Design an enzyme around this catalytic site. Structure first.
Site, PDB file in Angstrom:
ATOM      1  N   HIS A  41       0.915  -1.160   0.014  1.00 64.36           N
ATOM      2  CA  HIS A  41      -0.170  -0.030  -0.029  1.00 64.36           C
ATOM      3  C   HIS A  41       0.807   1.099  -0.018  1.00 64.36           C
ATOM      4  O   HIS A  41       0.314   2.414   0.130  1.00 64.36           O
ATOM      5  CB  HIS A  41      -0.926  -0.245   1.110  1.00 64.36           C
ATOM      6  CG  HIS A  41      -0.486   0.034   2.408  1.00 64.36           C
ATOM      7  ND1 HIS A  41      -0.843  -0.709   3.526  1.00 64.36           N
ATOM      8  CD2 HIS A  41       0.461   0.930   3.029  1.00 64.36           C
ATOM      9  CE1 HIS A  41      -0.155  -0.231   4.578  1.00 64.36           C
ATOM     10  NE2 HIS A  41       0.695   0.740   4.366  1.00 64.36           N
ATOM     11  N   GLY A 143       2.353   6.859   9.736  1.00 62.91           N
ATOM     12  CA  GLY A 143       3.843   6.708   9.007  1.00 62.91           C
ATOM     13  C   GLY A 143       4.344   5.383   9.641  1.00 62.91           C
ATOM     14  O   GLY A 143       5.612   5.269   9.277  1.00 62.91           O
ATOM     15  N   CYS A 145       3.625   2.359   9.524  1.00 61.02           N
ATOM     16  CA  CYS A 145       3.317   1.203   8.609  1.00 61.02           C
ATOM     17  C   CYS A 145       4.862   0.591   8.208  1.00 61.02           C
ATOM     18  O   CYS A 145       5.535   1.545   7.840  1.00 61.02           O
ATOM     19  CB  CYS A 145       2.224   1.173   7.773  1.00 61.02           C
ATOM     20  SG  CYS A 145       0.513   1.616   8.417  1.00 61.02           S
TER      21      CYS A 145
END
Ligand SMILES: *CC(=O)N(c1ccc(C)cc1)[C@@H]1C=CS(=O)(=O)C1
Ligand SMILES: *CC(=O)N(c1ccc(C)cc1)[C@@H]1C=CS(=O)(=O)C1
Lengths: 304, 304
Positions: A41, A143, A145
């Protein structure tokens, strides 16, 4: 003495954290040998997240669209591929700080350390369990991830988790390092409810052993029970059923303390039926279920 | 979202840990530049510990009696000196992994990360506070002495703690990196009782703010109080008195949540007077006091 929620030392993983930027999306990647692992993603706008076709989105991406930054130094991307829900970015330099490592897919009840990162810089480390509903109770801001979960056996980092999603109930979902989600979660901004957060019975018993070993003994009782009897009580309180495997795994703590697992089950049963009556165990007012038997033995015998 | 007891990443300190052996006593040392810091009781047998004269014991020691081992490589000791309750071992090589660092003596209520080590190998990392009785609630087994406590500000490690003593009540005592004990403790195997373990009021309020910020709001009430009124309640429950400095320090969390500190004090007061009635706050059944306002702001704004 003293018992603490303890993470592995984070050095070996601090050395693998990079920043991955695709267009205007930035998150964390894991640099091992000449591959950088990150959530797929990274290629999405939050517009994309409602119903992304990752295969179609990826077709518009080239090696040079994936900007990888290790501290201040830019890595050159010579290849990209999608594996399930992660990207693998082939870089032209092997990470000189690569530890010995494996990828392992953990089971619920298993615990691991999370190095929370923003922009490829580590902010802190904490201990987690994979919950029986395949969520983790993390601490993850925007942020974060691509942050990873790990165990260390002496020299070897076993990577078991990459952070992908915060569910609307502020619990966390993510993948092993092959990009397969734990549980039924998808990298999609949709309705995804967590199942029953059941207590990890074997871990609570381990923690009761840790308490005995460390002076806290008030909850030891006169009683015993059977696996079948204990399990009826476990069901009522949304505790995982206790198996003979769980009993076996607890054998070393049994042996060290001289308390039969079924006596400790009877202690836990009374604690479930009567609560702690305003008392504490290892400084906690509830029953901790994110220490494994292995975690208790490790912390109680000073393993490095 | 989610709130976790989070340690600093431990890499920068993992690179400073060595093994110090004097005769048959082995513990942990801290290698910074061309100095190794360790507890002076490295020169004692446990016989020595009942009533040691460190100045007399040290006279029998030479540079070559202090064996220093960084992983597998032996460091050469070209000098030794006693500073309060630590030894400084001058080695002939600067540690190439020395981070930017300071020595700071913390105040009670302040929190720090502990890298627990055995034989100069890190085993795990956890978060602590210096308690108002100048103990810490650690997890330390035999050989863990010389383990250090630290904060990290971006690139700079502030070392605030070296582990020396487990008190007979299984709490921990130790020194700053100048070898001065926190509190009245001595490196002597004697009767040393801890004072009242008072709760760090300013930290509990910070943690109540962390809870509001993360969805847990059930304990917000209709009431307010005054510093003087709140403090009467604090006294009764062995909470540290709340000062205007504490109020000021909580201002940023005040501003972000829109809850006046004195309204949050009234919330805490009700929680002290009524208990949590079997409910939880950030997954805890008691009032957590080892998050500082600075810790909450840091974890709630993803600082690295
Ligand atoms: C998960 C995460 O950390 N972020 C993220 C990125 C992309 C999508 C589709 C969801 C979530 C952060 C959000 C914005 S960011 O700073 O680019 C990374
Ligand atoms: C504090 C500590 O870790 N130890 C220690 C060493 C010497 C004295 C006088 C007290 C305590 C460990 C005990 C034995 S060891 O393995 O040599 C170090």
């Amino acid at each position: 003495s003293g018992f603490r929620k303890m993470a592995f030392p984070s050095g070996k993983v601090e050395g693998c954290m990079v920043q991955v930027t695709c267009g205007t999306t930035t998150l964390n990647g894991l640099w091992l040998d000449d591959v950088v692992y990150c959530p797929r993603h990274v290629i999405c706008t939050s517009e994309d997240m409602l119903n992304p076709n990752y295969e179609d989105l990826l077709i518009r991406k080239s090696n040079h669209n994936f900007l990888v930054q290790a501290g201040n130094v830019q890595l050159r991307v010579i290849g990209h591929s999608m594996q399930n829900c992660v990207l693998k970015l082939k870089v032209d330099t092997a990470n000189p700080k690569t530890p010995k490592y494996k990828f392992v897919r953990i089971q619920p009840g298993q615990t691991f350390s999370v190095l929370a990162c923003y922009n490829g810089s580590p902010s802190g480390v904490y201990q987690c369990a994979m919950r029986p509903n395949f969520t983790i109770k993390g601490s993850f801001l925007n942020g974060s991830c691509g942050s990873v979960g790990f165990n260390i056996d002496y020299d070897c980092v076993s990577f078991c988790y990459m952070h992908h999603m915060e569910l609307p109930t502020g619990v966390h979902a993510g993948t092993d390092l092959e990009g397969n989600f734990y549980g039924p979660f998808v990298d999609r901004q949709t309705a995804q409810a967590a199942g029953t957060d059941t207590t990890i019975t074997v871990n609570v018993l381990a923690w009761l052993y840790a308490a005995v070993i460390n002076g806290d003994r008030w909850f030891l009782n006169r009683f015993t029970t059977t696996l079948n009897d204990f399990n009826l009580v476990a069901m009522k309180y949304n505790y995982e059923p206790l198996t003979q495997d769980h009993v076996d795994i607890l054998g070393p703590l049994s042996a060290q303390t001289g308390i039969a697992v079924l006596d400790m089950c009877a202690s836990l049963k009374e604690l479930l039926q009567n609560g702690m009556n305003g008392r504490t165990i290892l400084g906690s007012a509830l029953l901790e279920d994110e220490f494994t038997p292995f975690d208790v033995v490790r912390q109680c015998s000073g393993v490095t």
